[PDB]
């Protein structure tokens, strides 16, 4: 008439240049999970972090950045960003005390700005000491609407889009650690990415019709790099909520969900009518493109209450592999 459990570590060895599926998990349930898939042996390893550390990842596992041979794991709903070995999936350090981190970009081996939600300060941390250094003050920007997201380096400046309850792009100078420019874009820009033609690529979700901030037709934007200025705009009518823009290894073809995953080349002029994928019957959530071969991995959330799947297609559309991961897969990172 008793109970037991506790965890037991097991050895892990990264045998190939695998892919890290960044499972978000539910929200206010603490069921975030991390997974590893090997594109060559066609074998997927789920719950790599729990089995290799005997302690759970957290809640709302957001994104992962791999630098050199170390991988940084962001847990949004636990104020913690990890640092794990990319070979044995073991913890070597952590950064805690954050407010609500989303994304991390390393300016150098010393400075790594961290984005947040529900806050207008961008954390500055030292990866080698796991200690908070300073904050970056975002103008006209408050806690009740706090939002920071994807950062893209361009020479000496970092561009970040303010997603949640925000409609502005911020350009940050790394040397002086202060914003220097701003552009006003549509409601709630989701993700920001960089191409070869030096044209900033992003989309704006309409967002939650009836929202206090407002409701609008989602759009797509292209922004010049050298001169921070809008260049071209696309409209995607009033339906659907686009998200998760991506590129390929060559940085010349654009991918985004908008129900029908759209595979369209860079420096085009119109949205192709045909869908790269038909948006069959489920609710896709994640998207990535291989930088070494060209495979397309599409993360399916199914019904948010069971294991999702990633569908692996080639650059032509040939089905290759369909494997299962944790609850609500949300992001990818390449080892």
């Amino acid at each position: 008439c008793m109970k037991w459990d506790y965890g037991k570590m097991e050895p892990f060895r990264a045998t190939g240049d695998g892919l890290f599926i960044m499972n978000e998990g539910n929200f206010q349930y603490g069921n975030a999970t991390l997974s590893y898939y090997d594109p060559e042996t066609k074998k997927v390893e789920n719950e790599i972090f729990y089995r290799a550390n005997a302690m759970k990842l957290g809640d709302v596992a957001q994104s992962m950045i791999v630098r050199d041979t170390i991988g940084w794991v962001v847990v949004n709903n636990s104020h913690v960003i990890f640092a794990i070995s990319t070979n044995t999936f073991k913890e070597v350090g952590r950064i805690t005390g954050l407010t609500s981190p989303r994304y991390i970009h390393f300016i150098s081996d010393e400075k790594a700005y961290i984005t947040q939600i529900w806050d207008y300060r961008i954390f500055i941390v030292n990866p080698k000491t796991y200690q908070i250094t300073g904050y970056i003050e975002c103008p006209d920007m408050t806690m009740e609407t706090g939002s920071t997201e994807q950062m893209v380096q361009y020479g000496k400046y970092v561009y970040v889009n303010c997603w949640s309850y925000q409609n502005r792009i911020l350009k940050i100078d790394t040397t002086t650690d202060k914003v220097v420019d701003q552009l006003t874009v549509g409601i709630q820009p989701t993700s920001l990415v960089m191409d070869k033609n030096f044209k900033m690529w992003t989309i704006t979700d309409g967002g939650y019709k009836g929202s206090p901030y407002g409701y609008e037709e989602p759009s797509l934007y292209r922004i010049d790099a050298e001169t921070f200025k809008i260049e071209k705009q696309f409209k995607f009518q009033l339906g659907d909520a686009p998200s998760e823009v991506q590129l390929n290894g060559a940085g010349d073809e654009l991918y985004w969900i908008n129900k029908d995953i759209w595979r369209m080349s860079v420096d085009e002029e119109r949205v192709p009518v045909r869908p790269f994928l038909k948006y069959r019957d489920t609710k896709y959530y994640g998207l990535t493109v291989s930088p070494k071969n060209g495979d397309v991995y599409v993360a399916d959330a199914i019904d948010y209450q069971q294991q999702g799947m990633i569908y692996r297609y080639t650059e032509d559309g040939e089905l290759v592999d369909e494997f299962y991961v944790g609850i609500i897969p949300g992001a990818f990172c390449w080892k």
Partner: protein, 621 residues
């Protein structure tokens, strides 16, 4: 001595000593240990959800003094906000029996009432609860009666910082070095954060009797609560508060006019409910205000044609008004029922119940129900019974008018239920008293309301979700007198309740078909024991829940596993009779074996904890 109203009905009743044993036990703690019901409750002073006979929370209708108490927006009630001493008589109606009194009770019905007192003169009671974790509980009682009046007043206050020591088997704290490297890992022992709470409950009762068959009453039940939301087990990092205040006033007026042959009852009531959500940290980060205005009315009749035949009629009407902001919606709820009970010979018994429901502007189909009872053998009171019905549950007010996702075109869920049971009652005079029952139930639910995402980008219920619920429920009560001063009582309940999702696969690859529903244990059993010797009292309570699945697919995962839940609570009571007062001393030990357990995913649990009560009942002239 079967009551005619209780013909072919599977129900259980909680005795006085079951409800009046501790002042810290809400109805969540009562149902967990005293029945086979699954109660999803991750601790004390927390959101408790009841899943009954394999169904969801919304399929358990709750009525206090006749009027329905379920939240109009959600359709489900938090059983942890109802103190046990505020309930003087409670009953459970299983499945088809909920037709006799309520409407869309696909799972079952919980009926709560306060019997009038029988105390002459002035009296008082005061008990104080001194417990671990810096938890304090109080309960004050004031009563009076003069053969034509029964005035009562209760006030229950419970407060605690609610910060207990638990060991994290889901988090690990590291020991750094001189060069910010790693040295050793260890499972930390931390304290519950943001779990502080304080609750106030006041119940005022006025009962009037005329002595000519007319009885009057007025019950007012005011509730003030201020509970915070506990942090997750793996919630480390930082200047934080998150509270859910809740103000509720529930009033019921009653008048009963009995006669020599027939009886008519009329009741009316009013409920004001106000919820506030606050999320702030060092700033009005999030706000939410919910206001509910509710009016109630009911008229009931009951006529005897003879000792063998009985007819009843009843009309009810609820009116919910909601102005949730920080939008205007309402619904009238008529419910007429007619029942006829015929008892041809001493062994046979039939009962037919017809119900009519009209919620808002849509008419539900006629709700029939047949109850039959037969006596197999009077040697051991072997009695078998069977019932069958088709019941309908209307969509909740949220699913209809939820502004970004409301579809007022939903169809009410339908459920076909049939069950067969047996019972026995063999007792020996002042030696032993054994009774128990076993019933097999089978139910199919169609058009189960399931919120699902839409292509536009919002959520909307789409019915579907055929569900098959069936199983076996067993009850057993035992009492024995070992010696002239030792009395032993044993109460045991057992239930095997699968809940299979029979619906079509929503997508190409869903492992949910043919699987158990989330957070419903396949097996369940409870056992309670009581031994008393003179003024010494020892009580033992034990509950068992099988594995609970956290995913629809029932997939095996290391990070989503919930082991079978076995808990043991023991309490020793001693009573002292002084000259001017009576003192009752009891001490409660919860989590007796001190297992670092887990009943809800990634939510911390306390260890072994103690609770001490001091009870004073003055003895006047």
């Amino acid at each position: 001595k079967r009551p005619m109203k209780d013909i072919g009905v599977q129900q259980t009743r909680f005795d006085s000593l079951v409800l009046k044993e501790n002042i810290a036990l809400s109805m969540a703690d009562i149902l967990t240990f005293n029945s086979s019901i699954f109660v999803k409750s991750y601790g004390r002073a927390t959101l408790s959800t009841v899943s009954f006979r394999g169904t969801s929370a919304s399929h358990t209708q709750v009525t206090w003094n006749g009027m329905r108490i379920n939240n109009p927006m959600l359709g489900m009630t938090d059983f942890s906000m109802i103190p046990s001493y505020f309930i003087d008589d409670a009953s459970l109606l299983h499945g088809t029996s909920s037709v006799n009194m309520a409407g869309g009770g696909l799972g079952g019905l919980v009926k709560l009432s306060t019997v009038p007192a029988h105390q002459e003169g002035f009296g008082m009671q005061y008990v104080q609860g001194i417990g671990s974790f810096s938890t304090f509980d109080e309960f004050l009682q004031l009563k009076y009666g003069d053969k034509h009046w029964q005035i009562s007043t209760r006030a229950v206050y419970q407060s605690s910082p609610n910060d207990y020591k638990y060991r994290n088997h889901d988090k690990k704290e590291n020991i750094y070095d001189d060069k910010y490297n790693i040295i050793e890992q260890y499972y930390p022992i931390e304290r519950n954060r943001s779990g502080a709470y304080k609750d106030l409950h006041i119940l005022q009762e006025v009962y009037y009797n005329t002595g000519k068959g007319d009885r009057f009453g007025l019950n007012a039940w005011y509730t003030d609560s201020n509970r915070e939301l506990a942090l997750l087990t793996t919630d480390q990092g930082d200047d934080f508060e998150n509270r859910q205040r809740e103000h509720t006033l529930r009033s019921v007026l009653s008048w009963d006019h009995t006669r020599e042959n027939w009886k008519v009852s009329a009741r009316g009531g009013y409920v004001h409910t106000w919820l506030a959500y606050d999320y702030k940290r060092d700033a009005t980060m999030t706000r939410s205000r919910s206001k509910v205005n509710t009016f109630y009315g009911q008229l009931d009749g009951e006529y005897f044609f003879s000792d063998k035949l009985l007819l009843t009629a009843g009309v009810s009407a609820h009116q919910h008004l909601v102005n949730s902001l920080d939008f205007d919606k309402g619904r009238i709820e008529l419910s007429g029922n007619v029942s006829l009970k015929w008892q041809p010979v001493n062994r046979l018994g039939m009962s037919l119940v017809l119900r009519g429901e009209m919620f808002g502007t849509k008419w539900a189909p006629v709700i029939p129900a047949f109850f039959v009872d037969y006596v197999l053998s009077k040697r051991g009171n072997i009695m078998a019974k069977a019932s069958i019905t088709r019941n309908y549950r209307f969509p909740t007010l949220n699913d209809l008018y939820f502004l970004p996702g409301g579809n007022p075109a939903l169809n009410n869920e339908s459920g076909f239920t049939y069950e067969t049971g047996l019972s026995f009652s063999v007792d020996k005079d002042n030696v032993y008293t054994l009774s128990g029952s076993a019933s097999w139930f089978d139910q199919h639910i169609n058009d189960w309301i399931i919120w699902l995402p839409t292509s536009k980008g919002f959520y909307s219920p789409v019915n579907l979700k055929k569900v098959h619920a069936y199983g076996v429920e067993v009850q057993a009560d035992y009492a024995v007198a070992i010696d002239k001063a030792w009395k032993l009582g044993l109460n045991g309940t057992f239930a095997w309740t699968p809940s299979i999702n029979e619906g079509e696969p929503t997508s190409k690859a869903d492992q949910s078909v043919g699987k158990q529903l989330p957070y419903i244990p396949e097996y369940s059993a409870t056992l309670s024991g009581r031994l008393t010797y003179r003024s010494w009292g020892l009580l033992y309570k034990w509950c068992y829940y099988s594995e609970r699945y956290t995913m629809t697919s029932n997939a095996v995962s290391y990070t989503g596993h919930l082991p079978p839940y076995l808990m043991s609570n023991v309490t020793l009571e001693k009573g002292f009779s002084l000259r001017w007062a009576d003192l009752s001393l009891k001490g409660t030990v919860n989590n007796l074996f001190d297992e670092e357990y887990l009943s809800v995913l990634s939510r911390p649990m306390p260890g072994i904890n103690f609770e001490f009560f001091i009870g004073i009942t003055p003895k006047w002239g």
